[PDB]
Amino acid sequence: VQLQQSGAEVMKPGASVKISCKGTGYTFSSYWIEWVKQRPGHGLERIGEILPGSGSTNYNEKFRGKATFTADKSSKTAYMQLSSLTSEDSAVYYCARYLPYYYAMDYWGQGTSVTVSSAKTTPPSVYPLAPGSAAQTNSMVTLGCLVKGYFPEPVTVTWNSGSLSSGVHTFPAVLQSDLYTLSSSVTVPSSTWPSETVTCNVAHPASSTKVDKKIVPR
Amino acid sequence: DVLMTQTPLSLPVSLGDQASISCRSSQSIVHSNGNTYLEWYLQKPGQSPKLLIYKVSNRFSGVPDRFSGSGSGTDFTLKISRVEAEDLGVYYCFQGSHVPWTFGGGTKLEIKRADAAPTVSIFPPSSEQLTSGGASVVCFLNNFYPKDINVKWKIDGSERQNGVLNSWTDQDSKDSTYSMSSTLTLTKDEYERHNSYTCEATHKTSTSPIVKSFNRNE
Numbered sequence: 001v002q003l004q005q006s007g008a009e010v011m012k013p014g015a016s017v018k019i020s021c022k023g024t025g026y027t028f029s030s031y032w033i034e035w036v037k038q039r040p041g042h043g044l045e046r047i048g049e050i051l052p053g054s055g056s057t058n059y060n061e062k063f064r065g066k067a068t069f070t071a072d073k074s075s076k077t078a079y080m081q082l083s084s085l086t087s088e089d090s091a092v093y094y095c096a097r098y099l100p101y102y103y104a105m106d107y108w109g110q111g112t113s114v115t116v117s118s119a120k121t122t123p124p125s126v127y128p129l130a131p132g133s134a135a136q137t138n139s140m141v142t143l144g145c146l147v148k149g150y151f152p153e154p155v156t157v158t159w160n161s162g163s164l165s166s167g168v169h170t171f172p173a174v175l176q177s178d179l180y181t182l183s184s185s186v187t188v189p190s191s192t193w194p195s196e197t198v199t200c201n202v203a204h205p206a207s208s209t210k211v212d213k214k215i216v217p218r
Numbered sequence: 219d220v221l222m223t224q225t226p227l228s229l230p231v232s233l234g235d236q237a238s239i240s241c242r243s244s245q246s247i248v249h250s251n252g253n254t255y256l257e258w259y260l261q262k263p264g265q266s267p268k269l270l271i272y273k274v275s276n277r278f279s280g281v282p283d284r285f286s287g288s289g290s291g292t293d294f295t296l297k298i299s300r301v302e303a304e305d306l307g308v309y310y311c312f313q314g315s316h317v318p319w320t321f322g323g324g325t326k327l328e329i330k331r332a333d334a335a336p337t338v339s340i341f342p343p344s345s346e347q348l349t350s351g352g353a354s355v356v357c358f359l360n361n362f363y364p365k366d367i368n369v370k371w372k373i374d375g376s377e378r379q380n381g382v383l384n385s386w387t388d389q390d391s392k393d394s395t396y397s398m399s400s401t402l403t404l405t406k407d408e409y410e411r412h413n414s415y416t417c418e419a420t421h422k423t424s425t426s427p428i429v430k431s432f433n434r435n436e
């Protein structure tokens with residue numbers, strides 16, 4: 001048994017997206033397909049269900065009219081169409097197999113990520129940072145690496161060939177106005193930071209952008 | 219739609235401690251067949267949910283015996299005999315009794331440990347920011363616990379609330395401590411006008427807010 005969902009989608013506000021869930025290894029037409037929305041913040045919200053064998057469909061009050069379910073019996077696939085995409089609709093959507101009263105949601109799709117934004121693909125602008133000059137130097141100090149002005153996700157930050165993996169603290173991306181950003185700081189010995197070379201790598205597969213900006217003492 | 223509520227919102231419990239998650243329904247969710255259909259799902263970060271329990275008590279195949287359930291017409295609870303690293307995640311209660319079927323609010327599970335004081339830091343902008351025509355002021359707080367953290371952007375005696383970014387990191391594994399990076403985007407026309415920039419952060423461990431500042435005039 002396996003539910004395969006479509007790829008990630010990025011669409012402009014007001015448009016409509018159609019994501020698909022393909023089930024194999026079981027009687028596709030005899031299991032309800034449950035659609036679940038997980039906003040990045042928190043919470044699982046069931047959108048509705050569809051029984052591919054028939055046309056029966058149910059929707060939660062919050063999504064009645066926002067989502068429409070269609071299923072293809074010939075190709076073991078089910079579709080959910082979202083209309084009038086706002087910024088709230090950006091989330092990860094899951095498809096699950098369910099048989100009411102007998103079997104629970106034992107198999108889930110990998111999850112499809114939908115992002116509603118007006119921006120276009122933009123390379124990152126990595127601005128490495130160092131401790132301020134007006135700051136006492138002690139045994140332990142924190143480094144600084146900043147990535148901003150990039151879109152869409154994701155962006156991976158790593159040190160030179162994983163030179164210093166443990167002890168690093170990356171942070172989730174956030175939107176200033178429209179573009180995403182990211183921060184990453186690591187702790188290194190005060191005697192090793194100036195002597196040894198420390199640098200943060202940046203990779204943006206969406207923009208096919210790779211950057212490498214070493215940070216030197218002020 | 220039947221409303222399902224979970225308590226507590228967060229349940230910090232150290233390793234090996236008993237864990238109790240309670241779920242309640244806005245209506246009775248019993249069924250005629252002698253069973254009431256309630257299921258418990260667990261989601262790890264960056265992963266699809268996983269079934270743990272169904273029909274209140276019946277335990278899914280392949281799940282550790284430590285998990286157990288119990289309840290009645292409108293009150294149900296989940297029990298974990300012992301907590302482990304894998305157990306960390308979010309737990310949801312799902313009702314499969316009345317159409318439409320709804321998820322619980324989600325009960326994040328956490329491991330409590332010896333709280334560590336935050337290690338605050340402040341990093342002024344870099345030459346690249348000046349050349350681009352911008353000024354980014356970011357505050358770092360690493361390896362702190364618990365979530366009782368507040369950050370105030372007081373600058374040269376002025377408290378500024380606009381353009382403040384809230385971005386913290388989920389609990390790690392090696393250290394099991396959080397982090398909190400706050401940023402303030404400044405323009406060149408405004409960046410140089412002010413003189414002193416400070417990052418006031420308050421934590422439970424230290425009642426007096428920790429102060430870290432730098433002066434533009436140098």
Ligand SMILES: *[C@@H]1O[C@H](CO)[C@@H](O[C@@H]2O[C@H](CO)[C@@H](O[C@@H]3O[C@H](CO)[C@@H](O)[C@H](O)[C@@H]3O)[C@H](O)[C@H]2NC(C)=O)[C@H](O)[C@H]1NC(C)=O
Pocket residue numbers: 101250251252253
């Ligand atoms: C529709 O009606 C049928 C027949 O009355 C119901 O089947 C019966 O369901 C109960 C509860 O699931 C079964 O009892 C349970 O059996 C399991 C497995 O042996 C056991 O672990 C439980 O402790 C309990 O004894 C019962 O065997 C089963 N009967 C038959 C003939 O299959 C069915 O539940 C009804 N479905 C709905 C949606 O109302």
